[PDB]
Each structure stands twice: as structure tokens, then as C-alpha cells.
Amino acid sequence: PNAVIGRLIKEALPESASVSKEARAAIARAASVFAIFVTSSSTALAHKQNHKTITAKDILQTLTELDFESFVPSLTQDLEVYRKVVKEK
Amino acid sequence: MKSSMDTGLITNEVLFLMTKCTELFVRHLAGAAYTEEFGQRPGEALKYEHLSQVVNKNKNLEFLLQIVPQKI
């Protein structure tokens, strides 16, 4: 969370840019709320269709619903590859 | 009802997707804050002000208003 997020931020910004000890803290806190919010929401959407657990489609729908639809493409391919390695060993 | 508390379990497939998109969000957030302030100018210093600025100027980042205040 403190280590892997610094690599995420360095990977997203120009290799020559920089982030203050302050900005990186905010980003990390934000990543946390983001995750709680998305789960909270995905949980909500899952009950609106009144089914027991949260599917990957519920999270995929909550993301497009929260305006983070640019995410869904990559996440679906990621989900495709995941489902494959699982159906093997 | 102590075998039905174990209802609504989070699956491996879900931990995965949740982790993958939180990383996407971190990268999205960092990068949006930078572009929105420096555009395509390189070697710049992203300060706190920029992050509160993108949270202010973005509707999907609305939920971060309380967690990323105007003044640190």
C-alpha cells in the first residue's frame, strides 16, 4: 500500500516527473476510499438484482456506473485471462 | 443463523478484480492530476494542490472530496 502504490504512481507519471511525500499520501488514501466505495456500491447493485454474492459483472457494472468505464475494457481482458489460468490448475 | 453469517462471501475472482481496478484507479488518479496541471510538460513536481484540484474538477472523483480536502 505504501510500497506498491509508489511504483503505481511512478509508472503513471512521466519518468522525469515527481510526487511530493504529501501527494503520494493522498493518492494512497484515495485508493483506499475508492476500493471501499466500489465494494460498497457493487454490494448495492448485487442486491438490486437480489442475488447472494458479488459477481465480477456486478463490479464491472458498478465501475461503468461510477463513471470509470474506461477501466472495464482492460479489466475484462484481465478477467478473461484469469478465468483461463484457473480452468487449468 | 451462524452458518448463514458466512453468506455473501468474497470470491478469489473478486479479490482479483478489486485489486486490479484499484491499481488502475491509482494510476488514473496520479496521471489525471498531472495532465490536468502540466498537460504534456515533463519533469514536473506533482504537489498536493494538484490532487485536490483534480478532485474538485472531476465528477467521478466526487467521492474523494472529504478524503482529499482543499487544504492539507
A5 alpha carbon, distance to own chain's centre: 13
Query: How many residues comprise chain A?
Result: 89
The span from the CA of B29 to the CA of B53, in Å, is 11
Which chain A residues have a beta carbon less than 8 Å from that of B33? 23
Are A61 and A45 spatial neighbours (Cβ–Cβ below 8 Å)?
Answer: yes
Are A56 and A30 spatial neighbours (Cβ–Cβ below 8 Å)?
Answer: no
Residue B56 DSSP SS3: helix
Integer CA distances (angstroms), B6 to A48, A50, B12, B61, in order = 20, 17, 15, 33
**Letter for the amino acid at B11?**
T
Longest dimension (CA), chain A: 49
Query: How many residues comprise chain B?
Result: 72
HSE of B65, CA atoms in CB hemisphere, 13 A: 7
The span from the CA of B21 to the CA of A78, in Å, is 10
Which chain B residues have a beta carbon less than 8 Å from that of A31? 22, 25-26, 29
**Exp. method:** X-ray
Contacts 24+ apart (CB under 8 A), B31-40: B31/A12, B31/A13, B32/B58, B32/B61, B33/A23, B34/A12, B34/A13, B34/A14, B34/A17, B38/A17
Grid cell, residue A85, equals 489460468
Grid cell, residue A58, equals 456486478
Grid cell, residue A73, equals 475494457
Q: How many CB atoms lie within 10 A of CB B52?
A: 20
- Our count of domains for chain A comes to 1
Say whether A8 and B30 touch across the interface (CB within 8 A): yes
Are B26 and A25 spatial neighbours (Cβ–Cβ below 8 Å)?
Answer: no
Residue B45 DSSP SS3: strand
What fold is seen in the domain B1-72?
Answer: Histone, subunit A (1.10.20)
DSSP 8-state assignment for residue A76: H
The span from the CA of B7 to the CA of A53, in Å, is 8
Work out whether strand B45-46 and strand A18-19 pair parallel, antiparallel, or are unpaired.
parallel
Q: What's A54's domain CATH number?
A: 1.10.20.10
Q: Nearest residue on chain A to B59, judged by CA atoms?
A: A67
DSSP 8-state assignment for residue B62: G
Q: What domain range is A20 assigned to? A: 1-89
Q: Which of A43, A3, A62 is nearest to B23 (CA)?
A: A3
